[PDB]
Design a protein around this motif. Structure first.
Motif: not given
Ligand SMILES: CCCCCCCCCCCCCCCCCC(=O)O[C@H](COC(=O)CCCCCCCCCCCCCCC)COP(=O)(O)OCC[N+](C)(C)C
Ligand SMILES: CCCCCCCCCCCCCCCCCC(=O)O[C@H](COC(=O)CCCCCCCCCCCCCCC)COP(=O)(O)OCC[N+](C)(C)C
Ligand SMILES: Oc1ccc(Cl)cc1O
Ligand SMILES: Oc1ccc(Cl)cc1O
Ligand SMILES: [Fe+3]
Ligand SMILES: [Fe+3]
Lengths: 257, 257
Positions: A172, A193, A195, A225
């Motif tokens: 990630p 973050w 994926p 996402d």
């Protein structure tokens, strides 16, 4: 030296809507003067940190691809992101992506499929530009310690549009928390973050290329996402071999140019 | 080191509205990828040119003052602009603003009035910070050739709240056409002009200060201010004396702190 053919009439309408909209949000939420000073300093910080491509791609580019999505019938697209580099070294249809001795230790990912047109005819001279991050979530050429084409390549799909690309499975991505983009996020309790994802530009002679990303079924941050760039049509469900490698097949459907 | 006390909850709601709104404008007008590259390069240019205060004040700050306008009962406010400087040298109630030998050649403007509270009681120890541009439309400290406090002062209103300030009449302001702010404007056939204006911050002991601007009845760009900062309540109608000087009276009504 980037340009577009936008008439003054169009820009004026866009400017009117963009500025009006912002101005309405200010009137809506009672944006105070101190908060205005905070917004002004933060826009200065963003540019001083070189984070305009980052901020824009994370928060704005999904809508730009969504526009392009309408005009398209092939494989779902996704945002480019800021980490693309042109002219990655060419490799044959069946290949292994360039990697360090570290990367060789990670469970391998064997990516197979075919480039085809809208009716399902295979396309000769198709190109698969693939880029992604290592298990430490860094991109080559955006990390001093990495070989400049680590996990970047130009896969030459055979006379039949086929490729068998062996790589590792990406980690990630976390957007630098230290800068203004991460400041904008920490200050709202968001999370910095993305994926795990493969980046792909897929082209063919006489075809409209596709910039897309591919994600992984189990994957975390899959349903949150930060770049809003995830589509369910782009989630891979790799199956694991008795060599212990991960195997997935995915085909690209190109539109005509 | 600028800060505000905005809870993450508030920022998240603002961010959601601001980003959603932009993203909607993109979806609305079919913002293409080339145009997106043009927008990204232009945001980089803006910061590289030091034009964030300029762009923001011209296009965004009117809405921030409009918010503050609601909570206020005194003299109408207007935007600060980017050209304010603190600690301009003090001058007495009746004074002449600091000027060059050039400025002495321009028709003089005699600005008179009184600082008072909401009921019309005069306020002792009131301050009038005045700044404006010369007849060439430049600000001191934002133009190498000018004395650093040209047409900037801290007028000390007398025991009764009164001032008689002799200055010149400001020229309309044109926003540098060469930079990204002017590029944004030229490219839509807008005009880079502000009506002629005085800048005033007015304070009193125990009063909520007022940042405001004052315009001129005849004045051009009066009904098309690019910063959208004009209010009819702030238009002066100066009358001319037999000395040939322009005379105007305007009072400031301060809110309580
Ligand atoms: C807090 C502020 C941020 C929000 C700002 C809202 C306004 C957004 C509209 C500005 C778009 C930027 C285009 C101005 C640059 C044109 C001048 C230029 O040098 O580009 C030229 C390109 O030639 C042109 O005239 C292109 C016209 C501009 C088209 C860009 C439109 C893109 C709009 C994006 C809006 C997305 C947000 C909703 C470079 O040649 P040198
Ligand atoms: C093309 C993109 C432009 C549009 C962007 C839309 C998003 C706008 C919202 C971003 C507001 C900027 C605030 C982030 C900075 C906070 C972190 C920071 O360092 O400030 C801190 C201040 O401490 C804080 O946490 C303040 C919280 C941020 C409040 C700012 C809200 C202002 C919103 C303005 C929206 C106007 C547009 C509509 C400095 O301490 P060092
Ligand atoms: O790796 C990435 C990080 C951030 C964005 Cl917006 C896109 C990416 O592809
Ligand atoms: O002189 C000025 C120029 C531009 C702005 Cl936004 C405000 C001013 O006061
Ligand atoms: Fe990425
Ligand atoms: Fe001004």
């Amino acid at each position: 030296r980037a340009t577009a053919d936008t008439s003054p009439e169009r820009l004026a309408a866009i400017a009117k809507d963009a500025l009006g909209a912002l101005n309405d949000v200010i009137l809506k939420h009672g944006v105070t003067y101190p908060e205005y000073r905070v917004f002004k300093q933060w826009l200065i910080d963003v540019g001083e940190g070189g984070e305009w491509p980052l901020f824009l791609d994370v928060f704005i580019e999904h809508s730009v691809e969504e526009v392009l999505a309408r005009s398209r019938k092939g494989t779902m697209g996704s945002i480019e992101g800021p980490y693309y580099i042109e002219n990655s070294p060419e490799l044959p249809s069946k290949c292994t992506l360039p990697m360090r001795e570290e990367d060789e230790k990670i469970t391998p990912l064997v990516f197979s499929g075919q480039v085809t047109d809208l009716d399902g005819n295979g396309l000769a001279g198709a190109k698969v530009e693939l880029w992604h991050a290592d298990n430490d979530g860094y991109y080559s050429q955006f990390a001093p310690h990495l070989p400049e084409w680590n996990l970047r390549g130009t896969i030459i799909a055979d006379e039949e549009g086929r490729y068998e690309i062996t790589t590792i499975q990406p980690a990630p991505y976390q957007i630098p928390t230290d800068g203004p983009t991460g400041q904008f996020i920490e200050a709202q309790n968001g999370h910095p973050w993305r994926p795990a994802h493969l980046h792909l530009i897929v082209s063919a002679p006489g075809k409209e290329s596709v910039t897309t990303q591919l994600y992984f079924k189990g994957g975390e941050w899959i349903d949150s996402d930060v770049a809003s760039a995830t589509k369910p049509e782009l989630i891979l469900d790799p199956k694991t071999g008795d060599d212990g490698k991960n195997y997935v097949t995915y085909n690209f459907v190109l539109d005509p140019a």
